[PDB]
């Protein structure tokens, strides 16, 4: 039904920042339901907040939402960050894609 497109992989050294964004193949003005999920390396899925919400995670992760141009930025990027998140659409069928940020020396 509705697909999402999100940016691909990136490589950073610890510090500075990286930003991630995605868009939905929609029209008119449906709202919210642009969520993110983290997939730690060998662990289960972790929730990174509903839009624009905040839960069991830190202040590095910053939410914003417009075609559903959705953003989740990572300030003060740290080493404990890999397969950082998937964009999840909350409409109709619900759907996921996935990006990747690697942080290393």
């Amino acid at each position: 039904q509705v697909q999402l497109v999100q940016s691909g992989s990136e490589l950073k050294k610890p510090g500075a920042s990286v930003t991630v964004s995605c868009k939905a193949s929609g029209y008119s003005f449906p709202t919210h339901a642009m969520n993110w999920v983290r997939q730690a390396p060998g662990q289960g899925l972790e929730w990174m907040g509903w839009i624009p919400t905040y839960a069991g995670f830190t202040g590095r992760f910053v939410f914003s939402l417009d075609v559903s141009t959705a953003y989740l930025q990572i300030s003060s990027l740290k080493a404990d960050d890999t397969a950082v998140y998937y964009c999840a659409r909350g409409h109709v069928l619900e759907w996921f894609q996935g990006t990747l940020v690697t942080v290393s020396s």
Binding site: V2, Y27, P30, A33, H91, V92, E94
Partner: protein, 1028 residues
């Protein structure tokens, strides 16, 4: 055990179409018949027995001497993979079987070699036990093979007519596409049936003896049109015509995306009803089958546009209004509704609406603890306008804390309750009806523009037929199309090229046939009304014309006039008197050139002239007497109709409904009676102008004038005179019938009319001119005539001097009118016309009874005998409305015709007064020359007058002079004119040359010789001179 030419059909193949006895009648019907003069294939067994196509109906015939043809096999695949039927005469009986037969490739009947085995049989029948033309018709309809048969002794395809009789209606259940003959171990013919119209002629014993193939040619069409086997003469309009469209021009906008319906119908989240939302659908292809041909919906209801029509339409925009309500609210989402949701949360216009769709969400929105996320309003100071939203949430005050309420209520949606309380998702689709170039269209393919020819078309939802042409109209950029004064598209903007095309209708018009009577020849010409013959000719050759006839062609005899074009009439460059008018100055006629129908310019009259002179005069020197015949209607048939019998004859249920139309039925009976009543008044006013009856004299020859042919003959069984007897001999309803129609007798019968007429002729023959003025005078006939001459201006002595010639001319004139009347057919055409119109009006009224006017039957008893009262009342009222209009139409037309008859009768009555009862002095009223006398004659439905007219004959030229000079005086003639004769001046009468001496007693003096222009010197005789 199995082994594995072309002829003209003439007028053969008519069969009885039904089981109904009819006699003395012409019956019109459409069925599958072999067309006359069709093409029939010859086969011989002298062994041509291939599989022959059936084509829904076969005319099969064979000539026999040795039982070569035994039967037929009808089927499709001619093998055991499909059902087929074998019809065989096995020399014992007729065996008919329908099975998946293991049929032979090379069958015969000797050993029977038709099939090896049989499976899955649907029908079997064995009949009773049992130089020659045998004819059969094999028709296929609704699972039945209908078979007709007939026979004629022959010696040979024989030409002739042989009505065939039904034999079988076989319930076989087989879809037959082809067949083979079963031959004995002869010749045959095969033709094909077509859905043509035939007029069938029944004789007095109910046998069909003749027929007309209504589509063979234009004359055959005319024979159907006027329901006759013979045509007399003139222009007969039979039908209309049009050009049939060729290609299809379909033009849809360049829309390539797909409409996002999932986003409307499958969204996770929906708004509450008090705060419903709207989203716009645009620039896409809308496949609406996705919402329609798979059921999710408990409600799928459309207004205006049926759901199945949506894929054929374009819209300017589509809007989807969506919300959640409970099951008992879903019924409120409709036009024309009231209620809390309909009035305060979501109002639809009481106008066309698109589609309201809904489905149950018990397992989505309702919860076990109650879902309270959905809300609705119950308190508002007024109702909503269509598509208005009001989501204000302020305290509500009923009077403008005690009585302070919040306006919103909720929906406690639970999964533990019944349907009326379960949540529903409701989507309303609003379609904007093409107010701007379309943005949403269905899954259609486009084609190119086919221009300047008759095509079918479909633009962005605008359809019809016509001729598309480029045009000069300049539309504003926001206009898609225009219209003329009537509500019809005049032009359309093309959705892909933005060019403007005007739309013209495809050529059409009336069709009429020009014909001499069929007694002279079966040759006709066809007139196509108001069209460019370029297109008519093209449509005939490039056959796109309807109607068109099977045996008809366009030759070189084609030309166009303002009245339309003719095909088949030869144009000539000459002129003549008009025979059969075409129109616009041109007439058709049938003349030798070997005869042909020709088209010629009308002649207006003889080309002749009279020289102008300032000094001459012509004066008739002789004369002749002739008799003119004048014919006019006086009265028409006194029809009468029983209103209830016509509409509700013998039906209680119909009569009870008829009463709901009140006074209507009585008014029809009254108005028609009033018309009939005036037919007696007219007859009486025209004929009964006789003060007293006068007797017929024993002497019928007075002064040399023979009246024996005008007056009644006492030695005959009748009271009619020879001429009257001839007039009468020369020119459905009860007189009871089931249709309630009847014709009443006249007040004055035929004998009374003849008696008045005889009294009137007899009387004026001896009564002089006072016959109807006062006391009759007894005047010798010769003197009466002398006075009628004196009354013109011819000196009285002329009658006596020329009495023998005058009496002889009178007699001869009487014989001449008898001869003309005896041998012609047109003299009384006016009386035949009033008779024919009566018959046509009544025939129309009777034919209307068979129309069902939309009812299941035209017969009330076919409604009542098999239908419950409630539905029968529906079917009966439909039938009554139609019949009320039939009767009202009849009376109205009969009423205007009555007015025309009264005008004719008034003329006749006036004419009787001025031409018969005295001597009229007016011009061109009682004849063409000078009136002397007239005689009325009795005639059916009218009066015929014989007028005796004085006509000046051969004239002589004289030199004239307006006055003469004598002794200084100017002398003028008192009554005559001055003329110059052999070397002498004489005075004469203008209508007859009889020169007198110019004297002082036939002239008078006024003025003198110096004051009158153009005069001569002369001598005026004065009798005094010889007295002196």
């Amino acid at each position: 055990r199995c082994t594995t030419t072309q002829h003209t059909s003439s007028m053969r193949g008519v069969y009885y179409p039904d089981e109904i006895f009819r006699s003395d009648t012409l019956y019109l019907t459409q069925d599958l018949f072999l067309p006359f003069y069709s093409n029939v294939t010859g086969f011989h067994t002298i062994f041509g027995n291939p599989v022959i196509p059936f084509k829904d109906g076969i005319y099969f015939a064979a000539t026999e001497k040795s039982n070569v043809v035994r039967g037929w096999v009808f089927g499709s695949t001619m093998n055991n993979k499909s059902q087929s039927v074998i019809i065989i005469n096995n020399s014992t009986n007729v065996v008919i079987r329908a099975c998946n037969f293991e049929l032979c490739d090379n069958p015969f009947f000797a050993h029977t070699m038709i099939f090896d085995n049989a499976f899955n049989c649907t029908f079997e029948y064995i009949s009773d036990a049992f130089k020659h033309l045998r004819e059969f018709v094999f028709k296929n309809k609704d699972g039945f093979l209908y078979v007709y048969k007939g026979y004629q002794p022959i010696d040979v395809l024989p030409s002739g007519f042989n009505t065939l009789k039904p034999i079988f209606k076989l319930p076989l259940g087989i879809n037959i596409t082809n067949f083979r003959a079963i031959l004995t171990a002869a010749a045959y013919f095969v033709g094909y049936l077509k859905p043509t119209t035939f007029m069938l002629k029944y004789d007095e014993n109910g046998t069909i003896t003749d027929a007309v193939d209504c589509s063979q040619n234009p004359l055959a069409e005319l024979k159907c049109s006027v329901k006759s086997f013979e045509i007399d003469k003139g222009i007969y309009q039979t039908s209309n015509f049009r050009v049939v469209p060729s290609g299809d021009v379909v033009r849809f906008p360049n829309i390539t995306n797909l409409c996002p319906f999932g986003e409307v119908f499958n969204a996770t989240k929906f708004p509450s009803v008090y705060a419903w939302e709207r989203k716009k659908i645009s620039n896409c292809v809308a496949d609406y089958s996705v919402l329609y041909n798979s059921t999710f919906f408990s409600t799928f209801k459309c207004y205006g546009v049926s759901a199945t029509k949506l894929n054929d339409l374009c819209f300017s925009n589509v809007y989807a209004d969506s919300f959640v309500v409970k099951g008992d609210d879903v019924r409120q989402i409709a036009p024309g509704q009231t209620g809390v949701i309909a009035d305060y949360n979501y109002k639809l216009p009481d106008d066309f609406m698109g589609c309201v769709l809904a489905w149950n969400t018990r397992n989505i929105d309702a919860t076990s603890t109650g879902n309270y996320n959905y809300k609705y309003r119950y308190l508002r100071h007024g109702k909503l306008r269509p598509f208005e939203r009001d989501i204000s949430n302020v305290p509500f005050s009923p009077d403008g804390a005690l009585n302070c309420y919040w306006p919103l209520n909720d929906y406690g949606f639970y999964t533990t309750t019944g349907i009326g309380y379960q949540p529903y998702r409701v989507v309303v689709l609003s379609f904007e009806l093409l107010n701007a170039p379309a943005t949403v269209c269905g899954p259609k393919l486009s084609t190119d523009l086919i221009k300047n020819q008759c095509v079918n078309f479909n633009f962005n939802g605008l359809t019809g037929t016509g001729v598309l042409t480029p045009s000069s109209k300049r539309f504003q950029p926001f206009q898609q199309f225009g219209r003329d004064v009537s509500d019809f598209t005049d032009s359309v903007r093309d959705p892909k090229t933005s060019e403007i095309l005007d739309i013209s209708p495809c050529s059409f018009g009336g069709v009429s046939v020009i014909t001499p009577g069929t007694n002279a020849s079966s040759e006709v010409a066809v007139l196509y009304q108001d069209v460019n013959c370029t297109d008519v000719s093209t449509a005939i050759h490039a056959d796109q014309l309807t109607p068109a006839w099977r045996i008809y062609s366009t030759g070189n005899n084609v030309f166009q006039t303002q009245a339309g074009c003719l095909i088949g009439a030869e144009h000539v460059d000459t002129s003549y008197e008009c025979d059969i008018p075409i129109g616009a100055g041109i007439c058709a006629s049938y003349h030798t050139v070997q005869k042909s129908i020709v088209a010629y310019t009308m002649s207006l009259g003889a080309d002749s002239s009279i020289a102008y002179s300032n000094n001459t005069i012509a004066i008739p020197t002789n004369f002749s007497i002739s008799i003119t015949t004048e014919v006019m209607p006086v009265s028409m048939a006194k029809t009468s109709v029983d209103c209830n019998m016509y509409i509700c004859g013998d039906s209680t249920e119909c009569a009870n409904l008829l009463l709901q139309y009140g006074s209507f039925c009585t008014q029809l009976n009254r108005a028609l009676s009033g018309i009939a009543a005036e037919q007696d008044r007219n007859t009486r006013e025209v004929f009964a102008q006789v003060k007293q009856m006068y007797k017929t004299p024993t002497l019928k020859y007075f002064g040399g004038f023979n009246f024996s042919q005008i007056l009644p003959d006492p030695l005959k069984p009748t009271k009619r005179s020879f001429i009257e007897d001839l007039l009468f001999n020369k020119v459905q309803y009860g007189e009871q019938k089931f249709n309630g129609l009847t014709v009443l007798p006249p007040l004055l019968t035929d004998d009374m009319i003849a008696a008045y007429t005889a009294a009137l002729v007899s009387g004026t023959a001896t009564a002089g001119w006072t016959f109807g003025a006062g006391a009759a005078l007894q005047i010798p006939f010769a003197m009466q005539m002398a006075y009628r001459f004196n009354g013109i201006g011819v000196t009285q002595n002329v009658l006596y001097e020329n009495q023998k010639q005058i009496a002889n001319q009178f007699n001869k004139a009487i014989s001449q009118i008898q001869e003309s009347l005896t041998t012609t057919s047109t003299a009384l055409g006016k009386l035949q016309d009033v008779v024919n119109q009566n018959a046509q009006a009544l025939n129309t009224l009777v034919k209307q009874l068979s129309s069902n006017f939309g009812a299941i039957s035209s017969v009330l008893n076919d409604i009542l005998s098999r239908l419950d009262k409630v539905e029968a009342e529906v079917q009966i009222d439909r039938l009554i409305t139609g019949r009320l209009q039939s009767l009202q139409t009849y009376v109205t037309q009969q009423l205007i015709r009555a007015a025309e008859i009264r005008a004719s009768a008034n003329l006749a009555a006036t004419k009787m007064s001025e031409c018969v009862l005295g001597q009229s002095k007016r011009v061109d009223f009682c004849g063409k020359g000078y009136h002397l006398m007239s005689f009325p004659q009795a005639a059916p439905h009218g009066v015929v007058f014989l007028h005796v007219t004085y006509v000046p004959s051969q004239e002589r030229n004289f030199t004239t002079a307006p006055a003469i000079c004598h002794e200084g005086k100017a002398y003028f003639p008192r009554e005559g004119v001055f003329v110059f004769n052999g070397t002498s001046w004489f005075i004469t009468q203008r209508n007859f040359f009889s020169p007198q001496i110019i004297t002082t007693d036939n002239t008078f003096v006024s003025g003198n010789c110096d004051v009158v222009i153009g005069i001569i010197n002369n001598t005026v005789y004065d009798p005094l001179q010889p007295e002196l």
